UniProtKB/Swiss-Prot annotation, chains A, B, C, D:
Higher taxonomy: Eukaryota, Metazoa, Chordata, Craniata, Vertebrata
Modified residues (Omega-N-methylarginine): R15
Gene that encodes the chain: TP53
Family per similarity comment: Belongs to the p53 family.
Protein name: Cellular tumor antigen p53
Residues of the full protein shown: 319 to 360 of 393
Effect noted on mutating K3E: In kidney cancer; germline mutation
Purpose of the protein: Multifunctional transcription factor that induces cell cycle arrest, DNA repair or apoptosis upon binding to its target DNA sequence. Acts as a tumor suppressor in many tumor types; induces growth arrest or apoptosis depending on the physiological circumstances and cell type. Negatively regulates cell division by controlling expression of a set of genes required for this process. One of the activated genes is an inhibitor of cyclin-dependent kinases. Apoptosis induction seems to be mediated either by stimulation of BAX and FAS antigen expression, or by repression of Bcl-2 expression.
Organism of this sequence: Homo sapiens
Outcome, altering R17H: In a sporadic cancer; somatic mutation
Amino acid sequence: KKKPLDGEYFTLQIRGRERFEMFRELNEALELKDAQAGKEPG
Amino acid sequence: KKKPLDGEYFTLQIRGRERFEMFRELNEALELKDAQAGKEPG
Amino acid sequence: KKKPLDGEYFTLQIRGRERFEMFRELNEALELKDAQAGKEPG
Amino acid sequence: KKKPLDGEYFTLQIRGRERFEMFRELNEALELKDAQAGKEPG
């Protein structure tokens, strides 16, 4: 796949397990849009 | 300080440096409210 | 389409136009996952 | 108070009552930081 350079990844400490699940959903949610954003124009 | 048990901390990989700054603001923003939430009733 | 009952919609005032675009992305991002979550099991 | 011009406010429709409470917390959380950000330097 060789891949382009993916956006630099950063780690983040999140207090509260509940908050982590919430942040994960927002994280995965943005990643999902990004996968479709990677769709060619048209 | 001995401290109570703080909420279990979790790490999260965030793609995109811009997204990290954004997630950090939400993270710090929630932590700030939590510091005031730790305020005694009354 | 008759539709099932969609989740009750709520309006929210967001200060700062920049914040609005940011909140909109998170909003649309969650809605996108929801559209795929509406996918039948399997 | 006369006030400066506050950031232009924008309304946003949020599906799911649960999501609304979540978005409200992030909204209030950012507003709280903004109130302290309005603190003079020093």
